[PDB]
From TrEMBL, chain A:
This is endopeptidase La. The chain holds residues 245 to 293 of 719 of the full protein. It comes from the Bacteria. Belongs to the peptidase S16 family. It comes from Meiothermus taiwanensis.
Length: 49, 49
């Protein structure tokens, strides 16, 4: 059981209330709206978690 | 590349000086963002006195 596929991912912490989390995305491509999914390569084996 | 580098963007201190024929800018001046970003228009008179 690898401890890499079974850990929570820190997306964003709370903004401590005021001011509200305001994100402006002038360049609204899908990678910048919905986020990215990277792959680590060890011994040439493409893995993602 | 499987995993990229999230290059955080850097402040811009340069000044941009576009050079082109009037009809080249005629296809660029129809964009409202072009008006706000390039304010100084240097006219080269085709003839001198």
């Amino acid at each position: 059981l690898d401890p890499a596929q079974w850990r929570p991912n820190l997306l964003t912490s709370s903004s401590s209330g005021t001011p509200p989390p305001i994100v402006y995305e002038p360049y609204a491509t899908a990678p910048r709206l919905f986020g990215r999914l990277d792959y680590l390569v060890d011994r040439g084996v493409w893995s993602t978690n | 590349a499987p995993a990229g580098l999230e290059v955080e963007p850097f402040p811009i201190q340069m000044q941009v000086i576009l050079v082109g024929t009037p009809e080249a800018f005629e296809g660029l001046e129809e964009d409202p963002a072009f008006s706000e970003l390039f304010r100084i228009r240097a006219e080269f008179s085709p003839t001198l006195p």
